[PDB]
Amino acid sequence: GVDIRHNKDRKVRRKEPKSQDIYLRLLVKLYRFLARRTNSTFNQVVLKRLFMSRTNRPPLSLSRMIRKMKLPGRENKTAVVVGTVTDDVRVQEVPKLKVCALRVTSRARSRILKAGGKILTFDQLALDSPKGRGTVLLSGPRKGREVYRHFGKAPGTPHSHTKPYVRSKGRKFERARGRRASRGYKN
Amino acid sequence: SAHLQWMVVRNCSSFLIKRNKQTYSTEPNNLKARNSFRYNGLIHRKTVGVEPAADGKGVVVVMKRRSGQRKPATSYVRTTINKNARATLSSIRHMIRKNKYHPDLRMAAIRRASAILRSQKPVM
Amino acid sequence: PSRLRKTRKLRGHVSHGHGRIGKHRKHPGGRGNAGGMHHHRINFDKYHPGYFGKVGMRHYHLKRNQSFCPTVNLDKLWTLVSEQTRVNAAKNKTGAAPIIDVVRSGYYKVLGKGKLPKQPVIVKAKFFSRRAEEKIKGVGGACVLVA
Amino acid sequence: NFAELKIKRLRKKFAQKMLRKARRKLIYEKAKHYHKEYRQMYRTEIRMARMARKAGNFYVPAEPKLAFVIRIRGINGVSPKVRKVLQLLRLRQIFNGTFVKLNKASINMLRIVEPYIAWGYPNLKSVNELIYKRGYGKINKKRIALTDNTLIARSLGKYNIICMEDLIHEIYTVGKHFKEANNFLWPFKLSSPRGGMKKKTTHFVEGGDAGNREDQINRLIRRMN
Amino acid sequence: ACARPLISVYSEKGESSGKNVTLPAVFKAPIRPDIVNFVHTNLRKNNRQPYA
Amino acid sequence: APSRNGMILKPHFHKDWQRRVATWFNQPARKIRRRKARQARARRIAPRPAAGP
RNA sequence: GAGAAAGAGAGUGGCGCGGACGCUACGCCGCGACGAGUAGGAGGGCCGCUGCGGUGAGCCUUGAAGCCUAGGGCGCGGGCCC
RNA sequence: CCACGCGUCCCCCGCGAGCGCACGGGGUCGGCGGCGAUGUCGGCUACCCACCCGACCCGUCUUGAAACACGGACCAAGGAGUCUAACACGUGCGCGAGUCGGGGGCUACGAAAGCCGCCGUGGCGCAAUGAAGGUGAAGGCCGGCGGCGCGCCGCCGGCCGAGGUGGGAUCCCGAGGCCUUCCAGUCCGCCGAGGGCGCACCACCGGCCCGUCUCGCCCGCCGCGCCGGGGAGGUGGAGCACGAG
RNA sequence: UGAAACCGUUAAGAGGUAAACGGGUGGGGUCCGCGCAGUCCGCCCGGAGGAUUCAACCCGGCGGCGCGGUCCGGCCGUGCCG
Ligand SMILES: [Mg+2]
Ligand SMILES: [Mg+2]
Ligand SMILES: [Mg+2]
Ligand SMILES: [Mg+2]
Ligand SMILES: [Mg+2]
Ligand SMILES: [Mg+2]
Ligand SMILES: [Mg+2]
Ligand SMILES: [Mg+2]
Ligand SMILES: [Mg+2]
Ligand SMILES: [Mg+2]
Ligand SMILES: [Mg+2]
Ligand SMILES: [Mg+2]
Ligand SMILES: [Mg+2]
Ligand SMILES: [Mg+2]
Ligand SMILES: [Mg+2]
Ligand SMILES: [Mg+2]
Ligand SMILES: [Mg+2]
Ligand SMILES: [Mg+2]
Ligand SMILES: [Mg+2]
Ligand SMILES: [Mg+2]
Ligand SMILES: [Mg+2]
Ligand SMILES: [Mg+2]
Ligand SMILES: [Mg+2]
Ligand SMILES: [Mg+2]
Ligand SMILES: [Mg+2]
Ligand SMILES: [Mg+2]
Ligand SMILES: [Mg+2]
Ligand SMILES: [Mg+2]
């Protein structure tokens, strides 16, 4: 007999992507090699972010791309997301960028290549910098989805600003007893 | 390329057969006849195949050239070796080694040619 | 696909994933949304506050077409008109401001959220925010009304 | 060319061979110095008892700094305050053993688990033969048997513990890096006792095996491994 | 890849003609058996009569 | 018996709805019937505008 | 595999034609610790049934499906092959 | 005695060659002997029988079933979480501030498939808040003109421009150093004290929009009015704060 | 086609703690191994053989690539410019 519990004995991570497309799995076959035979911890983060889900790879937009590139120090540096560099239309000027992503929106490709930057993908990033030397890794807003507004401390409860699941927003749809001091009680 | 069409062929090919907890592959230019990446003959640019001859005796050796990849009729060149068992194997060894032609299959082709010639010398 | 579903793994298990003590009975809590104020009050007040009661003025023959007034923000104002107009506005030394009819794009009201780039405009709309028209004045440009 | 590129390979190989030979002479003379130190430690507590009796006084020897706990009661039906103390003593299975240094913070832990452990003051032969026969090491949180000095030296080189008698010296003569040296050791999987226990449930004072059995833990160790 | 070879046009006698058209870019689109199997699954369910 | 969290909702299936159900399996049959009728009308009014007045 | 952060680094000045296996990378290999279980949850099935699109230049009157068996067997097992 | 040479200054009293034995990173023999054609060899399993040890009949509801609890004589076949709709979340796929033709139309398998784009009507999303009339999501700096007993701007010209603090995977810089005979000595790679620019996210402080309350002064004109706009300070919101559908 | 429960008969075996079961062997069957003088496979040495025989050269064909540092000519660019 051994006095240990087995509740968390199985760690819960991914070790392969749940996707079944072959180009992503060739990227995985490349970065498995580049993560265990380099001492760069960039390749482990790229390998771990290739496994992740669509909701764990949120799209990073172009006006946040350029904004996080306009910080000092990180000039003429390539810059890497693992998700999708979408266009942002509420920005007019666009500097030249060295972007490296899995899939870039066609309008964002036109926007970047018009400004004169270049768009690598990951098999080109491996040839350009195997240890990831001189990169800026970025990621989209992971709490950007609307389902992280329904989460947390429940409504009908003091100091909990949670959007409740309501079938149609109006004045008749959950405004009346929990929501008012006049009728019932306020939270 | 090669690694995409391997990941297409690897579970979906008509040459693959799977029974009795053993996996095989029946493409004509396969050495050791097993489903793997090194041995599959349809995929690569350069490929060695060993077949018994159209005659009862002799070993034909199949070499995939580099130019007509998309051209199947003018892609594979045949050469027939109807000789003694030692010089047949030295011919196949010189063709694979000294031409730098896909050197991982260098011993598997010699094993296969040695297994063909044993079947062609008469039954006990 | 029933081949992938749960019931293919629950054959042989004599309760089929619903328990021996509490059997899978038919309707143990009432049908539907039953018992709002009686025995599911804890759920309807921990998770749907405001669900019971009346509030506000009853408006009988409401027509969603009288109150049609869609909005657009100033940071996507220039996305209405093609890029050549604003490029030529940046290249023009005359000071000829481009004319942008937001109603032609399909937005009646202009609200002002974002930074608006510094070159003039003639923005014509059906309504305006206070901050939107003064952002248009701050870039220097006119707010034309239209009915 | 491969003329100087050849010879500098065996230059580097001969360099590290002589380095390994210097290390073996180092740990040889460290073991000799330890044998001298243990002779002096054994003879001085006889010397000072003799010089106390020669005057007619008494020589109280020092209270020992090192005990060896063994878990003699099983998994089942353990009170949780008794359970957490055993988990911090790393006595999880039945018949595990652990070296434990003594102080007020530890004796009051051991009296909480007095019904479940047998512990006493282990002899130099006990601390030797436990390390050599049943002593393994928590290397990369795995359990690798101590077969060579490099398994000890790679984990405990920065505490200047680089052979096996360095580990034995740090355990027995309880040193500065006793915490690290002992937590290196995996808990000793001792066998069930040959001959047999007296009585598992009652204390050693009342004719049993639980609790403090000070000099008599060595008789238990000799037949548990 | 990026390259577009020059694909020959064959006469009805079998042998190659002098006509020689370049390979269109459709033949360099990505090969995805996942998307092919998914669309084949969901579209072969459309030519299907009811039963009850 | 509602669970932890979700929309409380009003499905209008309290009536007998399986008796009154409109299956659309004649959708391509009507999309052939209309264009056959339309080709016949466009042949019938022979030079006149096919859409009508 | 070596107790000690890092180059079996480049440069300038004083005959015999030979070398096993491998790597379905979803593959193969190496260590360590562990294995109770009802209600329940999840994973893997080269476990099984019926039909459909592909495929095996599949099988079959020189005897398929089914059924029987003191025959030979494989798999922890569902089952399966002679 | 795990001590072995010589040469140099001063304190104190970096490649020697061979063989061999092995308590040395898990067993080998480079050791043997018998019996085998119609009476014998192997076959763990599957057939019958014998013996020792073990051994209550399943399902079930139950705190507890072998129960003097109910169901069941035996066998073959049929036999019970399905389908539609709504919702929620997790996953995979396409596109992406958009997205979708599902309704219509145009041209055996095929009632499929393709196509429309001045068929995006429309749905969802890109904006919230208020019962409602409604309103509807940064600012900062300079020059001029007890307004004086807004050193604080009413209005204009110019400029910077879209928060901060802590933690933060990644990266960037580099005091020094990674030897082959030694010194100077460049290039490539690597390690690293210390220091940065800090993703996502979390916590906190700010800021903006809508409702509400309080305090208070100023501005606008086609209608100078029971008109309209504005600020400061709390507070209510399923908000904004460089999309995420 | 002709299963199962159930039954008749033949053969074998057994029988006083109802039968049946798990673990362990033993005995008897029944068939199988087509057992019943027991494996081959490379390299070397020797002994007898038999070939139209190897190496090197010459001619022809086919193929691969220190890359012809830089041979001539094409075609392509999800490259640029005039
Ligand atoms: Mg155990
Ligand atoms: Mg458990
Ligand atoms: Mg768990
Ligand atoms: Mg169960
Ligand atoms: Mg359930
Ligand atoms: Mg029950
Ligand atoms: Mg229940
Ligand atoms: Mg109950
Ligand atoms: Mg139910
Ligand atoms: Mg009541
Ligand atoms: Mg007990
Ligand atoms: Mg005994
Ligand atoms: Mg429930
Ligand atoms: Mg278990
Ligand atoms: Mg018994
Ligand atoms: Mg019951
Ligand atoms: Mg009951
Ligand atoms: Mg009862
Ligand atoms: Mg119970
Ligand atoms: Mg009873
Ligand atoms: Mg009764
Ligand atoms: Mg009952
Ligand atoms: Mg009954
Ligand atoms: Mg739910
Ligand atoms: Mg999702
Ligand atoms: Mg709607
Ligand atoms: Mg009949
Ligand atoms: Mg009889």
Is strand G in 7 Å reach of the CB of A4?
yes
Is strand I in 7 Å reach of the CB of E1?
no
In order, the DSSP letters of A47-80 are HHHHHS-STTSPPEEHHHHHHHHSSTT-TT-EEE
CA distances from D196 to B109, D200, D209 (A): 67, 10, 11
- Phi first, then psi: give them for residue D110, nearest 5 degrees: -70, -25
Cα four-point dihedral sign B78, B81, B86, B90: negative
The strand I neighbours among B residues 66-85, by Cβ under 7 Å, are: 66-67, 77
Please name which of C119, C116, C125 lies closest in space to residue C143, comparing C-alpha atoms: C125
User: Distance from residue B35 (CA) to nucleotide G82 (C1'), in Å?
Assistant: 26
Note the ligand closest to the C-alpha atom of C20. 6
| Burial B47-77, CB ≥16 within 10 A → b, else e | bbbbbbeeeeebbbbbbbeeeeeeeeeebbe
Q: Which chains touch B (3 or more CB pairs under 8 A)?
A: A, E
Are 3 or more Cβ–Cβ pairs between A and B shorter than 8 Å? yes
Q: Which two tokens stand for residue E5?
A: 């070879």
On whether the CB atoms of residues B63 and B88 are closer than 8 A, the answer is: no
D87 touching A (Cβ < 8 Å): yes
| Distance between CA atoms of residues F43 and D89, nearest Å | 99
Are 3 or more Cβ–Cβ pairs between B and D shorter than 8 Å? no
On whether the CB atoms of residues A86 and A106 are closer than 8 A, the answer is: no
Describe the crossing of helices B106-120 and B85-97 by its angle, rounded to 10 degrees: 160
CB atoms under 10 Å from CB of A27, counted, come to: 22
| Distance between CA atoms of residues C104 and C144, nearest Å | 14
List, comma-separated, the residues after which chain C is broken, a break being a C to N distance over 2.5 A; otherwise answer none.
Answer: none
Which residue of chain B has the CA closest to A21? B7
| Distance between CA atoms of residues B70 and B42, nearest Å | 11
CA end-to-end distance (rounded Å), chain D: 60
On whether the CB atoms of residues F5 and C41 are closer than 8 A, the answer is: no
Residues of A in contact with F6 (CB under 8 A): 165
How many helices (DSSP H) and strands (DSSP E) are in chain B? 3, 5
CA distances from C74 to B98, C82, C113, C120, C134 (A): 72, 15, 6, 13, 11
3-state secondary structure of A31: helix
In angstroms, the separation between the Cα of residue B4 and the nearest Cα of chain A is: 7
| Distance between CA atoms of residues C136 and A54, nearest Å | 40
Please name which of C144, C98, C145, C93 lies closest in space to residue C117, comparing C-alpha atoms: C98
Q: Which two tokens stand for residue A181?
A: 């001091």
CA end-to-end distance (rounded Å), chain F: 60
**Chain-centre distance for alpha carbon A104:** 14
Q: Which two tokens stand for residue D107?
A: 């004796």
In angstroms, the separation between the Cα of residue E34 and the nearest Cα of chain B is: 10
Please name which of B21, B57, B43, B56 lies closest in space to residue B105, comparing C-alpha atoms: B43
| Cα C58 to ligand 6 centroid, rounded to whole Å | 54
| Distance between CA atoms of residues A87 and A101, nearest Å | 13
The strand G neighbours among B residues 59-98, by Cβ under 7 Å, are: 90, 93-94, 97-98
Q: Which chains touch C (3 or more CB pairs under 8 A)?
A: A, F
| Cα F3 to ligand 13 centroid, rounded to whole Å | 6
Asked whether the beta carbons of residue B70 and residue E33 sit closer than 8 angstroms, the reply is no
Are 3 or more Cβ–Cβ pairs between C and F shorter than 8 Å? yes
| Chain E interface test: which of B8, B10, B69 (most E C-beta within 10 Å) | B8
Nucleotide nearest to B78 in CA–C1' terms: I62
Vertex D30: Cα angle to D24 and D36 (nearest 5): 145
User: CA torsion D23→D29→D33→D35, rounded to 10°?
Assistant: 100
List, comma-separated, the residues after which chain E is broken, a break being a C to N distance over 2.5 A; otherwise answer none.
Answer: none
| Cα A54 to ligand 25 centroid, rounded to whole Å | 8
Bases of chain I below 7 A from a protein C-beta are: 43, 54-55, 62-65, 75-79
- Classify the phi-psi angles of B21: left when phi > 0, otherwise alpha if psi is within -120 to 50, otherwise beta: left
Q: Which chains touch F (3 or more CB pairs under 8 A)?
A: A, C
| Distance between CA atoms of residues C18 and C131, nearest Å | 60
Q: Which two tokens stand for residue C106?
A: 């399909």
Task: Say which of E30, E31, E34 has its CB closest to residue A20.
Answer: E34
Please name which of C96, C103, C109 lies closest in space to residue C81, comparing C-alpha atoms: C103
